[PDB]
Amino acid sequence: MNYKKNLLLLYDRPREPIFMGKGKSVFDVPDNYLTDRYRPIGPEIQNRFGELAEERIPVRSIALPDLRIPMSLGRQEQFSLFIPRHRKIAARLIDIFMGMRNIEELQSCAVFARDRINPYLFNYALSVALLHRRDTKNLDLPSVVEVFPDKYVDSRVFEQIREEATVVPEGMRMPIVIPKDFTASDLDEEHRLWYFREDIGVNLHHWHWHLVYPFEASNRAIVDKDRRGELFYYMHSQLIARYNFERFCNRLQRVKRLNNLREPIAEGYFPKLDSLVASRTWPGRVDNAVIKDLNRELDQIKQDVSDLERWIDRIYEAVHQGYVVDESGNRIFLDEEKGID
C-alpha cells in the first residue's frame, strides 16, 4: 500500500520539521503532534507549507507510548551504539516502533516522534524497525549517505553546496567535487590508504553489517542470527586482510596491533567531518595520544583501562584453557565447530 512509501518520506531532510513537506507530498499533522516551539503558531504553518504539494498525507491521532527515554538524548547531540546509555535509549525506541501492530500506527508514532528525538537516533531506530517487521519487508531504505552526508564528506563542501543552491538556478548547477586524500599530507605515510579507509563504499558496508547483526536489543528482536559470532570474527578479520593487502600496494608494512594500551598511539587522525546535526565537528586525535580512564557521567561510562586489561587477561586464559564459564558456573567448550562463534 501507500503507507510503505510514506514512511520513506521520514528519511527526507532529517532536520527540516515533518510539516515542511517531503518530496511531492506533505503531512497533515494534528496540533498535539506539533512541537512545543511551533505549536503556538501551528495555524500559520500548516497553511504556509501547504503550497507546492501534490499529495496530502493524513495522520490519525493515537495513544503513543511514553517517549521520555527516546527523548532523553539531546537533539543537537551525537549518537553512537557503542556508548552504554545510547544502547538503552535506541533499544527502547526500536521496541516502540517494533511494538506498533499496524503499519498505520507505525506511521502515526513515527510522524509524532520524528521532530522530538535525535535525527541520527531516529534514523537508526526506524531503519531497524522497518528491516525486521513483517509488513515492511523488501522495503528499499535510502542510503545513509543521502540522509546524513556529514558523516561521509569533507565539511568544506557544505558552504559550497549552500552557495551553489542559492545563487545558481536548477539545471545549470555544477556537480560538487568531493575532496579525496584530504585528511593528511605525504609527511604521514598513512594518507596513502585514503581510498580504502575513507571510501564511501566500505564505510557503508560496515555501518550496514552492524544494522543487520546488532549485539543488543532482544534475541527475538533480531540479535540471535546463525553464527553471528563467527561472522563478527570473519568479516572484521577480512577487513584487515584486505587492509594489509592495500598496505603492501603502498610500500608499507603489515598493520601493527595495539600491543598494550599504556604505550602511546603513534598515528593521530583528524577526520575533517562536521556534524550538521550536532552543529559541531568531530574531534581529532593528536600524535602520541595516550588512552585514559573514562569518567563520562552523562554517557554512563565509568571504566578504567585496567578493567579492559582484566577482560583481555581473562579471555586469553579461557582461550588457552580451551573453555569458558557461564554465569551459572558451568563450563562450555571451545570446540572446532562452535568455539569461534
CA 37 to chain centroid, in Å, comes to 27
Residue 246 CB, shortest distance to its own copies, in Å, is 17
Which positions make up the binding site for Cu(2+)?
A: 206, 210, 236
* Contact status, residue 216 vs residue 87, Cβ threshold 8 Å: yes
Q: What are the Cα distances from residue 198, in Å, to 88, 110, 150, 296?
A: 30, 32, 13, 29
C-beta closer to its own copies: residue 160 or 250: 250
Residue 291 CB, shortest distance to its own copies, in Å, is 21
Helix, coil or strand: residue 269:
strand
Residue 188 CB, shortest distance to its own copies, in Å, is 11
**Residue 316: CB atoms within 10 Å:** 10
Q: What are the Cα distances from residue 117, in Å, to 35, 67, 79, 152, 324?
A: 11, 9, 11, 22, 40
Which positions make up the binding site?
A: 206, 210, 236
C-beta closer to its own copies: residue 264 or 322: 264
Residue 265 CB, shortest distance to its own copies, in Å, is 17
Q: What angle do CA 18, 162, 145 make, to 5 degrees?
A: 60
Binds its own copies (CB under 8 A): choice among 37, 101, 251, 292: 251
Residue 285 CB, shortest distance to its own copies, in Å, is 21
C-beta closer to its own copies: residue 236 or 254: 254
Cell 522530538 belongs to 116
Query: What sections of the chain are H helices per DSSP?
Result: 2-7, 42-48, 68-72, 84-98, 103-113, 119-131, 144-147, 158-167, 194-197, 200-212, 228-248, 305-321
C-beta closer to its own copies: residue 60 or 254: 254
C-beta closer to its own copies: residue 186 or 336: 186
Rounded Cα gap, residues 121 and 89, in angstroms: 9
Residue 259 CB, shortest distance to its own copies, in Å, is 16
C-beta closer to its own copies: residue 188 or 293: 188
The footprint of its own copies on residues 292-311 (CB under 8 A) is none
Rounded Cα gap, residues 182 and 194, in angstroms: 8
One character per residue 164-203, x = contact with its own copies (rule: CB under 8 A): ----------------------xx----------------
Residue 247 CB, shortest distance to its own copies, in Å, is 13
Rounded Cα gap, residues 67 and 39, in angstroms: 18
Rounded Cα gap, residues 118 and 128, in angstroms: 15
* Contact status, residue 222 vs residue 196, Cβ threshold 8 Å: no
Q: Kindly state the number of chain residues that form the binding site for its own copies, as judged by CB under 8 A.
A: 4
Residue 189 CB, shortest distance to its own copies, in Å, is 9
Rounded Cα gap, residues 241 and 236, in angstroms: 9
Q: What are the Cα distances from residue 154, in Å, to 11, 62, 64, 68, 159?
A: 22, 42, 39, 35, 11
Does 253 sit near its own copies (CB under 8 A)?
yes
Q: What are the Cα distances from residue 185, in Å, to 157, 188, 268, 272?
A: 19, 6, 13, 13
C-beta closer to its own copies: residue 253 or 279: 253
C-beta closer to its own copies: residue 257 or 320: 257
Query: Contact positions toward its own copies, by CB under 8 A?
Result: 186-187, 251, 253
